[PDB]
Amino acid sequence: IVGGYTCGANTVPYQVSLNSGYHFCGGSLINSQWVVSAAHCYKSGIQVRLGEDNINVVEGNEQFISASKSIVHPSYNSNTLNNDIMLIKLKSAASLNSRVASISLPTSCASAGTQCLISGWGNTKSSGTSYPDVLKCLKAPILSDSSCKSAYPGQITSNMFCAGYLEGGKDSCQGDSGGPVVCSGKLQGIVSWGSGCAQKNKPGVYTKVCNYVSWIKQTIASN
Ligand SMILES: NCc1cccc2c1OCCCO2
Ligand SMILES: [Ca+2]
8 A cells, every 4th residue: 555554453354464475465354254355366375364463473363264265256357357356265264353354245336436445565655665564554535437447548347446546646556456445334346456556647446346246145155
C-alpha cells in the first residue's frame, strides 16, 4: 500500500497472508475453512497465515494452516486478468476469534464513490521498493466505471472496478495482490492489477467480487 497508514495489529481480522516460504499475496477469510484471493496469486503449496500483524515476527495470535485445495475461476484469463479470483480451502478450520474473523460477501455491487478499506503487506513506495513488516491500510473510494475505463482503455471488463485517487499518491501495490477491498462491511474487491502504483490517472484495478457470489457459494458448498 502506497500512501496509506499502519492499520494497527489485528484491526483487519479477515486479512490473511499467503506464504510459500515468504509472503507473496494477500487474501480474505470468508468462513472458517475458505479464503478468497486473486487467481494470479495461484501457486501449489500455499500456507495461509491468519491473525498476522508483523509478518516477520511471531506475536502470538497467528494461525498457520496449509491449503488443501486451490480453485481458480473457470474463466480466469491470465492474458487480460479477467476473472482474477480464486478460492483456497484450509486443511483444517481456522479458530475464529477477535483477531481471526470472516468478512461477509456482497449482495449487489457497490456504487461509485462508496468508501472502502484496502489492506496488505505490499510495496509502500510509488518509485522505489520498500516492504513493510506490519499490515498497512488505505481508505479509497470506488471510482466511476467511466473514469476507470478512461484510465485503462480497452482493458477494463465488467468483472473489474477501479478504486483510489486519480491524482495519485494513494494506491495498492505489488505484494498487496489478492487482498481485500471492503466497503460497507462487504468484500467488494480483490487486489488485482494496475499500471505502477499511485501514478496520476492510473488507479488500482480490483476484481468485482459481487459478480462472483453465486460461483463462490456453489463452489464452497460442493467442495
Ligand atoms: N497499483 C495497483 C497494483 C496492485 C497490485 C499489484 C500491482 C499494482 O500496480 C501495478 C504495479 C504493481 O503491481
Ligand atoms: Ca507475525
